Specification:
The PDB classes it as immune system. The complex is a heterodimer of chains A (213) and B (218). Chain A has 213 residues and is mainly β. Chain A has no helices and 18 strands. Chain A has strands at 3-7, 10-12, 18-25, 34-39, 46-51, 57-58, 67-72, 77-82, 91-97, 103-104, 108-112, 121-125, 136-146, 152-155, 164-172, 175-185, 195-200, 205-210. Chain B has two domains: 1-113, Immunoglobulin-like (Sandwich); 114-216, Immunoglobulin-like (Sandwich). The chains are: A mainly beta (213), B mainly beta (218). Bound molecules: 4-(4-styryl-phenylcarbamoyl)-butyric acid.
C-alpha cells in the first residue's frame, strides 16, 4: 500500500508558528525530491517548498525566510516549519512525492486567524406551512455560526445520498453558515427516521437532528 | 518557470460522447530519457485532487481507460470517451519535469443535459432558532438545468432583498443538474411582524415563476 499522510494543521495567530509533518507507507522520502504545496480557496495549487535527495532546499520568494522544509531520513518523516504566519498562508497543505507518478496526501488545514474556534448551531428544516407535502419530501439542516471550515453533513450514516445537496458555506461577519438538503419519497418519511449528522472536527463537536413533521 | 496554459471552460458535453481538454507548456516536457513529464489531475468539490494520468499517457490507479492523453512536447490533449455524469469537475494539467513545480489553471468540464425546472421548498424558522432570537427562512431550489436561475423574496406580498444570502452547488455528479439555497435572515421581532413569506424562482424552463410560501400564524 502507498500513501502519504499530513498532520499538524490547525488555527494559528497572525505572526505565529506551526510545524507540519508527513509520514508515508511505501515511499522512502530520502530517495526523492519531496515537496509541500498548498491550496487556497480561489486558486490552482501553489508550491511552498522542496528538498532534494541530497538535502538541498528550494523555496519560492513568497515564503523564503519564513518556512523551512526538512527530512528525518531514518524515521522517514517530512517536515514544514512555518513562522511569521500571515492570513494569506491560510490553506490546505499537502506533502508530495512529485517525481514520476506523483503521490500526495489528503492535506492538512492551516488557518491563520485571531478568531476563535466556534461550534455550529444546527437547525432542522422540515415542512411546516400547511400540513401537505408531495410525492417526494425535501428535508434539510441549516448549520450556522461555526468557525473554521469545514463541516460534514451526513444523512442516515451516508445511506441517504438520495439526492443529498451540500451547499457551499458563506462567510458572514466572522462566522460560516451552510445548509444541506436531502430528498426522500413521502412513503419513507416520516414513517421512518431521517437524521442529519453534522460533524465539526475543529470544535470537537457532532450534532444529530432527527427531522420531525 | 514552465508556464502551463489551459482554458477555464470546455464545450458542454452530452453524456456518452467525447470531451477534449487542451493544455500547453512554454518548454518541451520531453526529457532526454524519452518520457514526457506531463500529468493530469481532477478536482471535485468535497474531495481531494485525484491523479488521472502521468508521464503524458500512463493511466493512474483506479482510472478507467476512457481517459487518454496525447501530445507533442509542448501541446497536449486529454480526451474522455463516453463521458459519464461522475466525470464532472475541474481538470488540471501540470508538469513534473523540473522545479519549480507548475500547474495549469484548470478546465471545468460541463455536462449538457435536458432542461429541468427546479423543485422549490420553503422552510420557516425553526422554533429552536427563534428561541435564540434569530429567524432564517430557507428556500431550496433543487435539481434544475440549465444553471441560470433567479430567486425573489416576498414578505406580505412586498419584494424583499436585504438579508438574503444565496449559495449554489456545482454540477451534480449523479444527474448533472444544479441546485441553490436561498436564506432570508431577520431578527425574531421583524419576522413576527409579518405573516406571509414567499420564495419565487424564475428559470428558462417556464416564463412564470415557481412560487412557494407559508403564513407564519399557521
Ligand atoms: O526530478 C526532477 O528533477 C523534477 C521533479 C520536480 C517535482 O518534484 N515536481 C513536483 C512537486 C510537487 C508536485 C505536487 C503536486 C500536487 C498535485 C495535486 C495535489 C497535491 C500536490 C508535483 C510536481
Amino acid at each position: 500500500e502507498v500513501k502519504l499522510v499530513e498532520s499538524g494543521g490547525g488555527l494559528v495567530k497572525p505572526g505565529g508558528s506551526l510545524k507540519l509533518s508527513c509520514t508515508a507507507s511505501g515511499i522512502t522520502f530520502s530517495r526523492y525530491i519531496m515537496s509541500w504545496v498548498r491550496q487556497i480557496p480561489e486558486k490552482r495549487l501553489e508550491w511552498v517548498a522542496s528538498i532534494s535527495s541530497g538535502g538541498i532546499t528550494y523555496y519560492p520568494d513568497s515564503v523564503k525566510g519564513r518556512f523551512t522544509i526538512s527530512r528525518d531520513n531514518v524515521r522517514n518523516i517530512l517536515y514544514l516549519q512555518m513562522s511569521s504566519l500571515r492570513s494569506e498562508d491560510t490553506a490546505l497543505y499537502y506533502c508530495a512525492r512529485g517525481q514520476g507518478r506523483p503521490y500526495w496526501g489528503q492535506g492538512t488545514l492551516v488557518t491563520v486567524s485571531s478568531a476563535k474556534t466556534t461550534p455550529p448551531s444546527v437547525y432542522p428544516l422540515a415542512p411546516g406551512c400547511g400540513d401537505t407535502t408531495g410525492s417526494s419530501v425535501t428535508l434539510g439542516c441549516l448549520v450556522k455560526g461555526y468557525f473554521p471550515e469545514s463541516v460534514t453533513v451526513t444523512w442516515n450514516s451516508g445511506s441517504l445520498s438520495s439526492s443529498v445537496h451540500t451547499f457551499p458555506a458563506l462567510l458572514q461577519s466572522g462566522l460560516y453558515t451552510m445548509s444541506s438538503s436531502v430528498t426522500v419519497p413521502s412513503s419513507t418519511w416520516p414513517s421512518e427516521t431521517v437524521t442529519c449528522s453534522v460533524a465539526h472536527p475543529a470544535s470537537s463537536t457532532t450534532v444529530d437532528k432527527k427531522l420531525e413533521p | 518557470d514552465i508556464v502551463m496554459t489551459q482554458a477555464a471552460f470546455s464545450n458542454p458535453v452530452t453524456l456518452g460522447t467525447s470531451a477534449s481538454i487542451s493544455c500547453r507548456s512554454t518548454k518541451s516536457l520531453l526529457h532526454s530519457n524519452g518520457i514526457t513529464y506531463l500529468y493530469w489531475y481532477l478536482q471535485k468539490p468535497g474531495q481531494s485532487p485525484q491523479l488521472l494520468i502521468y508521464q503524458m499517457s500512463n493511466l493512474a490507479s483506479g482510472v478507467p481507460d476512457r481517459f487518454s492523453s496525447s501530445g507533442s512536447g509542448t501541446d497536449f490533449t486529454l480526451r474522455i470517451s463516453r463521458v459519464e455524469a461522475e466525470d464532472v469537475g475541474v481538470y488540471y494539467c501540470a508538469q513534473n519535469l523540473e522545479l519549480p513545480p507548475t500547474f495549469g489553471g484548470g478546465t471545468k468540464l460541463e455536462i449538457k443535459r435536458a432542461d429541468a425546472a427546479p423543485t422549490v421548498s420553503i422552510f420557516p424558522p425553526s422554533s429552536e432558532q427563534l428561541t435564540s432570537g434569530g429567524a432564517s427562512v430557507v428556500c431550496f431550489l433543487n435539481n434544475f438545468y440549465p444553471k441560470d436561475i433567479n430567486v425573489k423574496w416576498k414578505i406580505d406580498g412586498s419584494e424583499r432583498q436585504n438579508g438574503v444570502l444565496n449559495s449554489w452547488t456545482d454540477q451534480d455528479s449523479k444527474d448533472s443538474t444544479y441546485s441553490m439555497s436561498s436564506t432570508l435572515t431577520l431578527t425574531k421581532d421583524e419576522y413576527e411582524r409579518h405573516n406571509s413569506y414567499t420564495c419565487e424562482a424564475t428559470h428558462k424552463t417556464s416564463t412564470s415563476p415557481i412560487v412557494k410560501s407559508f403564513n407564519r400564524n399557521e
